[PDB]
């Protein structure tokens, strides 16, 4: 295990914990705000995936300050994880190309 593959893996586990904590905390944040749809755990979990990937369909979104603060942490964990996989793939390819050039 090279750093880049350990980091990629670490980021995958950590993203899964953020999707779950974020589902829980969003529901807690959002109930009490009239009109809020982000208020049961199963679709909160769907919401957290859709936010973390940045698809953002808009079937669900938080309307409270704390729902929105939670949503910002999910966006950033998701963009960073997926960026940390791209960076780990780039590290693999560069090494392979060196080895091939005979370097």
């Amino acid at each position: 295990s090279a750093l880049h593959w350990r980091a990629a893996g670490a980021a995958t586990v950590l993203l899964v914990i953020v999707l779950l904590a974020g589902s829980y905390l969003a529901v807690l944040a959002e109930r009490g705000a009239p009109g809020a749809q982000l208020i049961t755990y199963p679709r909160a979990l769907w919401w957290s995936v859709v936010t973390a990937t940045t698809v953002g369909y808009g079937d669900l979104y938080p309307v409270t300050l704390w729902g929105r603060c939670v949503a910002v942490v999910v966006m950033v964990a998701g963009i960073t994880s997926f960026g940390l996989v791209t960076a780990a793939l780039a590290t693999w390819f560069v090494g392979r190309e060196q080895e091939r050039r005979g370097h």
Partner: antibody
Framework: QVQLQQPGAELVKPGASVKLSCKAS????????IHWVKQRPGHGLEWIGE????????NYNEKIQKKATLTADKSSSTAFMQLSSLTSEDSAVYYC???????????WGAGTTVTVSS | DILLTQSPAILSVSPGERVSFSCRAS??????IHWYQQRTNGSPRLLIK???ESISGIPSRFSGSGSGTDFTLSINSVESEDIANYYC?????????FGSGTKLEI
């Protein structure tokens, strides 16, 4: 098993308060909300409010005069609703129900009949 | 806050016949509608959740249907144990609200 356990009745004097209770058993998750519903004699059900015992966070029906204050004791698996400064408009049956956070009341208490009289 | 309208308030059917209770929502709530039975001096009892999904415990006689603003609980072959008050409740938007309710009467 009986999952929610409520007292059968309380008498309360006009202007007095009372602390209703609800002892849960069976599966008691972190994810669980306890709800309180008020049924006046020959009327329908009114959602009054909800507490999550794990966090102790509570929301109320703001469409009505606020009489309730929801508290949970996580050690004794018990939800409380303090109803204060009661008139006769407040005479009713109050149920607790358990919602798993997917939006429906799976399991109800038998309810507490609260009579406000002198 | 969402408004659950249950009309009519009383429903008179003959023994063995099919009965339908209506719930109309004031704005679209998908299928986030659940139905409770309350017999004289009983607690409410979940019958249907998510509009059409069965709860085990419940005679197959009980069905539900509907999507958006129009929901229906059905009892195919009403029997005497069905005499009760039927309520709808939505979980689409905060807070949870109930219907005004419908008395079945044989």
């Amino acid at each position: 098993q009986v999952q929610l356990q409520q007292p059968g009745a309380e008498l309360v004097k006009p202007g007095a308060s009372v602390k209703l209770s609800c002892k849960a058993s069976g599966y008691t998750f972190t994810s669980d909300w306890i709800h309180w519903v008020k049924q006046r004699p020959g009327h329908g059900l009114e959602w009054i409010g909800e507490i999550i015992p794990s966090y102790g966070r509570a929301n109320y029906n703001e469409k009505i005069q606020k009489k309730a204050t929801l508290t949970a004791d996580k050690s004794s698996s018990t939800a409380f609703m303090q109803l204060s400064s009661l008139t006769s408009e407040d005479s009713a049956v109050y149920y607790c129900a358990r919602e798993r956070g997917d939006g429906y009341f799976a399991v109800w208490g038998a309810g507490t009949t609260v009579t406000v009289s002198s | 806050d969402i408004l659950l309208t249950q009309s009519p308030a009383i429903l008179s059917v003959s023994p063995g016949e099919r009965v339908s209770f209506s719930c109309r929502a004031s704005q679209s709530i998908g299928t986030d509608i659940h139905w409770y039975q309350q017999r004289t001096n009983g607690s409410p009892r979940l019958l249907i959740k998510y509009a059409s999904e069965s709860i085990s415990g419940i005679p197959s006689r009980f069905s539900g249907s509907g999507s958006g603003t129009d929901f229906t609980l059905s009892i195919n072959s009403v029997e005497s144990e069905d005499i009760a008050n039927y309520y709808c409740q939505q979980s689409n938007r905060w807070p949870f609200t109930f219907g005004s309710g419908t008395k079945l009467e044989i």
